[PDB]
C-alpha cells in the first residue's frame, strides 16, 4: 500500500539514503534522481550532477571492459571512489539488489547509484590492486598457491550470493578485485546477476563470457548456482596457464557443449588435490558439479596441502601456457 508512495518521495531528487530505499527507486529506472549510501558522497540541493557535483579524474583513465569505470571525487568532500557508467535503456536492477545491503569482504561495496539524462551512474569503492585479470597479464600466470588462495577467496563471495538467491552471472579474472597489497580479492559486476527462486536464454538477457561460460547455458538446460561453480574454475584455469579455456585449440559454444570439460588443460605439475577440485567444479552436469561450499573447502585443503600461501604478491614472470 504505502511502497507507491515511498517511491514518489525518493523519486525526482537525490538523497542520502539506505539500501532498500536505493533498490525500490532503481525498479524505475529499468530527471536527475538517486540515492547514496554513504557521507563521503554527498547531494546539494536535491541533485548530485557529474562535473557540477561530482568529477572524474584527469586525465581519464578506464578500466572495464567498455571503459566504463573510472575514479572521480566528490567535489564537496574530497572523497575518492569509482564509477561505472550504466546506459539507461538497459539497465537492470539486479546490478544493485545483487550488491546492495550485502555486507561482505568479498563483495565490492556500493556507495549509491544516480540516474543523469541517459546515465545511470553507480558508484563503488575504488580498489588500487586492479583486477585479477590485470594480474595474470603483468605476472604471465600465478603459481599454484596464489591461485588457490584467490579460487577460494572469490568463491567465499559465490557462497554469500548463493546463500541470498543471486547468481553473479560472469565470474572471470577480470571480475575480481584486488586490494592494494594483493591479499584480498573481491568480486564485481554483478550486470548479469539474477535472483532466483529455489535456464537464462528468453529474451532481454545478456550473458557472460563465452570462453567461461557452463555447458547447461550453452545448450539451453536450465541453469542454477552451479554455473558460477563452473565460471571459476574456468578462472583458476586461467589463473595457472595465463589464457582462457579452450582459446589455444578452437566457434566457442560449440565444442563447450559437445567437447569433454577441459580437465585437460588442467597443468600437470599442479598437486593432486588442485587438480582434482578443479574437475568437480567443471562436471558437465550441474547436479554431479561442486557447490561453492563444497569447492571451497577442497582449495582451501588444496591450498594447505602445497603448504599454504608462500608466493609473493607480484614475483617473476612467468611465461604461459
Ligand atoms: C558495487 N558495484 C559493482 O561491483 C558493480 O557491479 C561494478 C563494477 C565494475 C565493472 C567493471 C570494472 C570495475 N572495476 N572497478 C574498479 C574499481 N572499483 O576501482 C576496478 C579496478 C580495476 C578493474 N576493474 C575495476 C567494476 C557496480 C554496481 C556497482
Same mark, same amino acid.
Given at each position: ?145 596464489? @591461485? /588457490?588462495?584467490?579460487? $577460494?577467496? %572469490? !568463491?567465499?563471495?559465490?557462497?554469500? =550470493?548463493? &546463500?541470498?538467491?543471486?547468481?553473479? +552471472? ?15 580479492? @573481491? /568480486?564485481?559486476?554483478? $550486470?548479469? %546477476? !539474477?535472483?532466483?527462486?529455489?535456464? =537464462?536464454? &528468453?529474451?532481454?538477457?545478456?550473458? +557472460? ?15 542454477? @548456482? ?96
Amino acid at each position: 500500500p504505502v511502497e507507491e508512495y515511498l517511491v514518489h518521495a525518493l523519486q525526482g531528487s537525490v538523497s542520502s539514503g539506505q539500501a532498500h530505499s536505493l533498490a525500490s527507486l532503481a525498479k524505475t529506472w529499468s530527471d536527475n534522481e538517486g540515492v547514496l549510501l554513504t557521507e563521503k558522497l554527498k547531494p546539494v540541493d536535491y541533485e548530485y550532477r557529474e562535473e557540477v557535483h561530482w568529477m572524474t579524474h584527469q586525465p581519464r583513465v578506464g578500466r572495464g571492459s567498455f571503459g566504463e569505470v573510472h575514479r572521480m571525487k566528490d567535489k564537496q568532500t574530497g572523497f575518492q571512489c569509482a564509477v561505472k557508467k550504466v546506459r539507461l535503456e538497459v539497465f537492470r536492477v539486479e546490478e544493485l539488489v545483487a550488491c546492495a545491503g550485502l555486507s561482505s569482504p568479498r563483495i565490492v561495496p556500493l556507495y549509491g547509484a544516480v540516474r543523469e539524462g541517459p546515465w545511470v551512474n553507480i558508484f563503488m569503492e575504488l580498489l588500487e590492486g586492479g583486477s585479477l585479470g590485470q594480474l595474470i597479464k603483468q605476472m604471465g600466470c600465478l603459481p599454484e598457491d596464489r @591461485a /588457490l588462495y584467490y579460487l $577460494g577467496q %572469490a !568463491l567465499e563471495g559465490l557462497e554469500y =550470493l548463493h &546463500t541470498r538467491r543471486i547468481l553473479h +552471472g560472469d565470474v572471470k579474472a577480470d571480475n575480481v578485485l584486488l586490494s592494494s597489497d594483493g591479499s584480498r580479492a @573481491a /568480486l564485481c559486476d554483478f $550486470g548479469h %546477476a !539474477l535472483c532466483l527462486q529455489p535456464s =537464462l536464454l &528468453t529474451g532481454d538477457y545478456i550473458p +557472460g563470457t563465452e570462453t567461461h561460460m557452463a555447458p547447461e547455458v550453452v545448450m539451453g538446460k536450465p541453469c542454477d @548456482a552451479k554455473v558460477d561453480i563452473w565460471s571459476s574454475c574456468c578462472m583458476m584455469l586461467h589463473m595457472l596457464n595465463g589464457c582462457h579455456p579452450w582459446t589455444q585449440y578452437f566457434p566457442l559454444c560449440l565444442k563447450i557443449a559437445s567437447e569433454p570439460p577441459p580437465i585437460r588443460e588442467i597443468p600437470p605439475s599442479c598437486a593432486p588435490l588442485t587438480a582434482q577440485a578443479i574437475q568437480e567444479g567443471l562436471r558437465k552436469e550441474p547436479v554431479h558439479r561442486a557447490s561453492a561450499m563444497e569447492l571451497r573447502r577442497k582449495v582451501g585443503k588444496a591450498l594447505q596441502e602445497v603448504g599454504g600461501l608462500k608466493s609473493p604478491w607480484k614475483g617473476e614472470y612467468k611465461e604461459p601456457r
